Design an enzyme around this catalytic site. Structure first.
Site, PDB file in Angstrom:
ATOM      1  N   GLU A  57       6.803   3.445   1.989  1.00  0.00           N
ATOM      2  CA  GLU A  57       5.524   3.771   1.370  1.00  0.00           C
ATOM      3  C   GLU A  57       4.731   4.960   1.919  1.00  0.00           C
ATOM      4  O   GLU A  57       3.818   5.437   1.246  1.00  0.00           O
ATOM      5  CB  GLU A  57       4.616   2.538   1.363  1.00  0.00           C
ATOM      6  CG  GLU A  57       3.850   2.329   2.648  1.00  0.00           C
ATOM      7  CD  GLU A  57       2.417   1.921   2.392  1.00  0.00           C
ATOM      8  OE1 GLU A  57       1.645   1.870   3.364  1.00  0.00           O
ATOM      9  OE2 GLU A  57       2.062   1.657   1.218  1.00  0.00           O
ATOM     10  N   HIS A 116       3.291  -6.867   2.101  1.00  0.00           N
ATOM     11  CA  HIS A 116       2.465  -5.752   2.540  1.00  0.00           C
ATOM     12  C   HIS A 116       1.005  -6.187   2.540  1.00  0.00           C
ATOM     13  O   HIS A 116       0.321  -6.089   1.518  1.00  0.00           O
ATOM     14  CB  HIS A 116       2.677  -4.566   1.590  1.00  0.00           C
ATOM     15  CG  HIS A 116       2.495  -3.235   2.240  1.00  0.00           C
ATOM     16  ND1 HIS A 116       1.428  -2.410   1.958  1.00  0.00           N
ATOM     17  CD2 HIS A 116       3.230  -2.593   3.179  1.00  0.00           C
ATOM     18  CE1 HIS A 116       1.516  -1.318   2.694  1.00  0.00           C
ATOM     19  NE2 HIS A 116       2.600  -1.403   3.444  1.00  0.00           N
ATOM     20  N   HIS A 141       0.606   2.622  -1.237  1.00  0.00           N
ATOM     21  CA  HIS A 141       0.698   4.036  -1.574  1.00  0.00           C
ATOM     22  C   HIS A 141       1.941   4.340  -2.400  1.00  0.00           C
ATOM     23  O   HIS A 141       2.402   5.478  -2.460  1.00  0.00           O
ATOM     24  CB  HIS A 141       0.689   4.875  -0.298  1.00  0.00           C
ATOM     25  CG  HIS A 141      -0.663   4.978   0.333  1.00  0.00           C
ATOM     26  ND1 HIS A 141      -0.902   4.645   1.650  1.00  0.00           N
ATOM     27  CD2 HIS A 141      -1.853   5.376  -0.178  1.00  0.00           C
ATOM     28  CE1 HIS A 141      -2.182   4.832   1.922  1.00  0.00           C
ATOM     29  NE2 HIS A 141      -2.779   5.275   0.830  1.00  0.00           N
TER      30      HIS A 141
HETATM   31 FE   LIG Z   1       1.917   2.022   5.517  1.00  0.00          FE
HETATM   32 FE   LIG Z   2       0.099   0.286   3.587  1.00  0.00          FE
END
Ligand SMILES: [Fe+3]
Ligand SMILES: [Fe+3]
Length: 281
Positions: A43, A158, A72
């Site tokens: 990411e 995440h 992201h």
């Molecule tokens: Fe990251």
């Molecule tokens: Fe992150």
């Protein structure tokens, strides 16, 4: 005999530093653990955010087999239609329909590897501040689990909070093969095979700039943010490098994790020694 599958999971790839330390060590690591597969969260690959096609192929040619993402995921606009549509790339499944890209690519994928149906799922924690809306990770993964189609299920959660991470661990402990947290860029000393036979770790850590950077970014803008409050652009750090990951091997028969070990490599940079951030810099 008992045949098993040996994996290597690397944390958030961040910038050129992350890209380089992975290229210079993956073969050695893959060899040392006799790994069969390599999975990485990428990411932060391109300029600290997102993944370009160029960089996707770089990681691919470096030895990476599968990729998971995070908040992201959609920053590199120019190649996103092509990159996130890649068959061996999984993005957060946890997306609300109001969000464009809620259907761009896979949130979970399945492939078979030597008598084993393996699933890889990526989710976004509710504790992560996002520009868009997401659906509940707990509910989403639960429904997917009830679909019951896989021997092994690898999950990259995440999330930002240690409480959300561990609550997630407590909720799905034996219903999945692994629960690996990512996003904070700092590995936890949490790694273990759980009492239920899964592998868990609050945070795998990051593969990017090393000591002398702030979670991958140049310290200057960071210190200013926490002091004066300036909103000056973040900048990718070129100071040293670090590689953080997890090695784990399952057992195709019992499909329980049989072994785990934290992977860490640190490269210090002399250029950090010349820095004097104390002059709140
Ligand atoms: Fe990251
Ligand atoms: Fe992150």
């Amino acid at each position: 005999m008992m045949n098993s599958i040996k994996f290597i999971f690397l944390g958030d790839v961040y910038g050129k530093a992350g890209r380089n330390i992975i290229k210079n060590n993956l073969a050695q690591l893959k060899s040392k653990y006799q790994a069969d597969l390599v999975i990485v969260n990428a990411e932060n690959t391109t300029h600290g955010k997102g993944l370009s096609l160029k960089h996707y192929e770089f990681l691919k040619e470096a030895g990476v087999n599968y990729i998971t993402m995070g908040n992201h995921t959609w920053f590199q606009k120019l190649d996103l239609a092509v990159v996130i549509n890649k068959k061996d790339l999984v993005r957060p499944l946890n997306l609300d329909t109001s969000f464009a890209f809620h259907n761009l690519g896979q949130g979970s994928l399945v492939f078979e590897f030597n008598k084993a149906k393996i699933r890889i799922t990526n989710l976004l924690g509710t504790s992560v501040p996002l520009p868009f809306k997401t659906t509940n990770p707990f509910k989403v993964l639960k429904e997917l689990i009830l679909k019951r189609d896989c021997d092994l299920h690898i999950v990259d959660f995440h999330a930002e909070t240690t409480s959300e991470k561990n609550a997630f661990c407590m909720a799905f402990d034996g219903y999945v093969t692994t629960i690996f947290g990512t996003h904070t860029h700092v590995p936890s000393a949490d790694l273990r095979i759980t009492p239920k036979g899964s592998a868990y770790i609050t945070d795998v850590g990051m593969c990017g700039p090393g000591f002398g950077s702030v979670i991958g970014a140049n310290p200057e803008q960071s210190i200013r943010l926490f002091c004066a409050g300036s909103r000056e652009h973040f900048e990718v750090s070129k100071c040293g490098a670090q590689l953080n990951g997890v090695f784990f091997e399952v057992d195709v028969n019992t499909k329980k994790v049989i072994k785990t070990e934290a992977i860490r490599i640190v490269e210090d940079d002399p250029r950090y020694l010349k820095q004097d951030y104390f002059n709140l810099i």
